[PDB]
Structure 1
Amino acid sequence: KGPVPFSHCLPTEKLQRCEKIGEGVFGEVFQTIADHTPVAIKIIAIEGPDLVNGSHQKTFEEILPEIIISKELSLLSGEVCNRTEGFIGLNSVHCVQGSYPPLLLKAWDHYNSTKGSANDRPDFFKDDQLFIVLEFEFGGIDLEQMRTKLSSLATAKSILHQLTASLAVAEASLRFEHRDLHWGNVLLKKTSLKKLHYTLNGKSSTIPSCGLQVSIIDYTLSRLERDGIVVFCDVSMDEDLFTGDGDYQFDIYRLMKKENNNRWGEYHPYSNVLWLHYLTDKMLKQMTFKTKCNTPAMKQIKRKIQEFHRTMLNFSSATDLLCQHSLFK
């Protein structure tokens, strides 16, 4: 009941350890350390009248749906009938009031000097500015940035299997559609577990990890429901979203609109299949692997992912894919 200073979420040592790891129009993301453990901090300026990164700031009401979705998906990790850890874990959410911390400005500058930013330097906010600060588990590095960094198509298959299981569990539990699962929104980090665990409608199984754990992020466009109350981003009046070019990503927006007849409140889990198909297309055409497929077992994996690419679009949901596709048997 009432906003807190930045110091409540980001005391001095946590601020001193912030390094920027990502950005977009409606968010800056920093990695920091709490109790010897990496965490990701997303910060969003809200409720103010000033343009930020070329756009108006979100109101609390416009951003709340995305926070609700975050929480619901995170909670799946502690469920029973429909359990997955494949969505980014949400540790805390605060509403903060203050000027941007100078230590954060220093981390912002460093990223701008080294990687380059499309954002405004966040130095013009006044001491009445509101922010939402979200603390997430640290999810690693996105698939796009790992384009040339994965061992083999065995790794690609673990990723696709993880993604398919996480989405199926979310379909089953929450009638979830991600709706924007481009390869910037698939995060990869090292795990020492050989096998990862999920439960889909009460039936548990495992996925060989190939040394990686996948986390799904960014619910800008996502949709889910509980007890008939639907949380979604109504893009029926957006034009720009559907006129992009130069990447299959931009056809996927058009194909979702075709599937749902521009009715974004409806549940069309085929959109998850569309995204998984885009991801499979990236694995086969844009990713490049350290070790190519040279042994029997490896060539078979390659042929199976190829077969997944040309067949998966005849399945109706991630649930259907996980339970019926030969790639996962």
Structure 2
Amino acid sequence: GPVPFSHCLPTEKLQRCEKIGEGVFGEVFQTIADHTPVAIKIIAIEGPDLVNGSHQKTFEEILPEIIISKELSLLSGEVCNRTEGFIGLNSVHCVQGSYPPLLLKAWDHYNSTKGSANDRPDFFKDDQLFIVLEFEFGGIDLEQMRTKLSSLATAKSILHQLTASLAVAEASLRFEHRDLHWGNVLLKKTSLKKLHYTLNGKSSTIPSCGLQVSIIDYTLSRLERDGIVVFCDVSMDEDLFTGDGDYQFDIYRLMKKENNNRWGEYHPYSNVLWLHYLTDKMLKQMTFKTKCNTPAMKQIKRKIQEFHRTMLNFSSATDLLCQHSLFK
């Protein structure tokens, strides 16, 4: 059954861990595996203690995230519906133990520097189970990059990449993300001038503006293969739908309105709602190195604003990608 933490995180690997993010789910650490950067997401399961305000998931409840992360990681090697826009998943393990002191040290450093909304994970007993998901290191989330983009042209590339990635996943898997807040959009520098994707056998390119965008976090996602749906049933989760202070929290209520609290159903419009949320972040909450001040540039901005006010009349990411003027 489960392996000890040291199977996954031997000493040199633990010593190189730096905490890079968190959520109610648990903790994310960056480290190195065989000279390669990775991101490790650690989720406590099956235990009785409250963790970060919630009871722990069971194996059955964590399985949908695991399945979808795997299925989406495969899209980079497919052919008819191919994209590198979703994070690569390297491995999944079930680990048993108390939290490693070295992870706690990394946890403390993050709390001392950025502040944490989580419980310090020091109360777990030596029989505690965790799921440990090791992903490719995808770069820095859009939220943390909100002051770091070159200009609105970069924003355009980012929106195009996200729309293409979601379209490819809609086509292949009838995928909805359902939680694509700006912490879940990663950016990494790339030397490639053009990025490629293939949608239903047709290959296209997108100018990178020097960034490759990776989508992460399938805790609320839904997809289906051969009529078997894998999803998060949030029909009894009342708190998901009472958040405030950010447009993000409206999106959950809107999704619920549009699917009648039936989470198994396919409503690809939910990908449009998140894209609209993201476009808003780009227009309101980002500062750019190059400004709102040349003709070529002001035109790009006018196009992003026109996209913002018209995108909600498209039925899916595929519909936006294929029919919206922003991408023509």
TM over 0.5: yes
Moved more, 237-246 or 156-165: 237-246
What SS is found at the alignment partner of 1:148?
A: coil
Q: How far has the Cα of 1:85 moved from its partner?
A: 0.9
Q: Distance in 2 between matches of 1:24 and 1:39?
A: 18
What SS is found at the alignment partner of 2:182?
A: coil
Q: How far has the Cα of 1:101 moved from its partner?
A: 1.3
Moved more, 122-131 or 69-78: 122-131
What SS is found at the alignment partner of 1:146?
A: coil
Q: What do the CA deviations read for 1:43-82 (whole angstroms, capped 9, x no partner)?
A: 1111111122222111111111111110111111111100
The aligned length equals 328
Q: How far has the Cα of 1:236 moved from its partner?
A: 2.0
Q: What do the CA deviations read for 1:99-151 (whole angstroms, capped 9, x no partner)?
A: 21111111111111111112122122222111111100011111111111111
Q: Distance in 2 between matches of 1:188 and 1:307?
A: 24
Q: How far has the Cα of 1:274 moved from its partner?
A: 0.8
Q: Distance in 2 between matches of 1:74 and 1:128?
A: 31
Q: Distance in 2 between matches of 1:180 and 1:314?
A: 20
Q: Distance in 2 between matches of 1:143 and 1:286?
A: 11
Q: How far has the Cα of 1:305 moved from its partner?
A: 0.6
Q: Distance in 2 between matches of 1:208 and 1:41?
A: 30
Q: Distance in 2 between matches of 1:114 and 1:246?
A: 24
Q: How far has the Cα of 1:258 moved from its partner?
A: 2.2
Q: Does 2:289 match 1:302?
A: no
What SS is found at the alignment partner of 2:43?
A: strand
1:321 corresponds to:
320
Q: How far has the Cα of 1:318 moved from its partner?
A: 0.3
Q: How far has the Cα of 1:285 moved from its partner?
A: 1.2
2:21 corresponds to:
22
Q: Distance in 2 between matches of 1:299 and 1:116?
A: 38
Q: Distance in 2 between matches of 1:47 and 1:240?
A: 21
What SS is found at the alignment partner of 2:144?
A: helix
**In the superposition, relative to structure 1, how do residues 63 and 309 fare at CA in structure 2: closer, same or farther (>3 Å)?**
same
Identity %: 100
Q: Distance in 2 between matches of 1:240 and 1:57?
A: 16
Q: How far has the Cα of 1:303 moved from its partner?
A: 1.0
Q: How far has the Cα of 1:163 moved from its partner?
A: 0.4
Moved more, 152-161 or 294-303: 294-303
Q: What do the CA deviations read for 1:214-264 (whole angstroms, capped 9, x no partner)?
A: 111111211100111111112222322222222221221122122212211
Q: Which runs of 5+ in 1 are unaligned?
A: none
**In the superposition, relative to structure 1, how do residues 123 and 243 fare at CA in structure 2: closer, same or farther (>3 Å)?**
closer
**In the superposition, relative to structure 1, how do residues 196 and 310 fare at CA in structure 2: closer, same or farther (>3 Å)?**
same
Q: How far has the Cα of 1:86 moved from its partner?
A: 0.8
Q: Distance in 2 between matches of 1:16 and 1:122?
A: 17
Q: How far has the Cα of 1:37 moved from its partner?
A: 2.1
1:51 corresponds to:
50
Q: Map 1:62-211 to 2 at 5 A.
A: 62-211=61-210
Q: Distance in 2 between matches of 1:132 and 1:237?
A: 24
Q: Distance in 2 between matches of 1:235 and 1:128?
A: 29
Q: What do the CA deviations read for 1:253-281 (whole angstroms, capped 9, x no partner)?
A: 12212221221111010110111011111
Q: How far has the Cα of 1:92 moved from its partner?
A: 0.5
Q: Distance in 1 between matches of 2:54 and 2:79?
A: 41
What SS is found at the alignment partner of 2:183?
A: coil
What SS is found at the alignment partner of 2:188?
A: strand
What SS is found at the alignment partner of 1:323?
A: helix
Q: Distance in 1 between matches of 2:201 and 2:148?
A: 35
What SS is found at the alignment partner of 2:41?
A: strand
Stretches of 4+ aligned residues off by more than 4 angstroms:
none
Q: Distance in 1 between matches of 2:96 and 2:4?
A: 5
What value does the CA root-mean-square deviation take over the aligned residues?
1.1
Q: Distance in 1 between matches of 2:246 and 2:289?
A: 24
Question: Structure 1 length normalisation: TM-score?
Answer: 0.97
**In the superposition, relative to structure 1, how do residues 287 and 14 fare at CA in structure 2: closer, same or farther (>3 Å)?**
same
**In the superposition, relative to structure 1, how do residues 106 and 146 fare at CA in structure 2: closer, same or farther (>3 Å)?**
same
What SS is found at the alignment partner of 1:145?
A: coil
Q: Distance in 2 between matches of 1:126 and 1:236?
A: 32
Q: Distance in 2 between matches of 1:40 and 1:14?
A: 12
Moved more, 254-263 or 153-162: 254-263
Question: Structure 2 length normalisation: TM-score?
Answer: 0.97
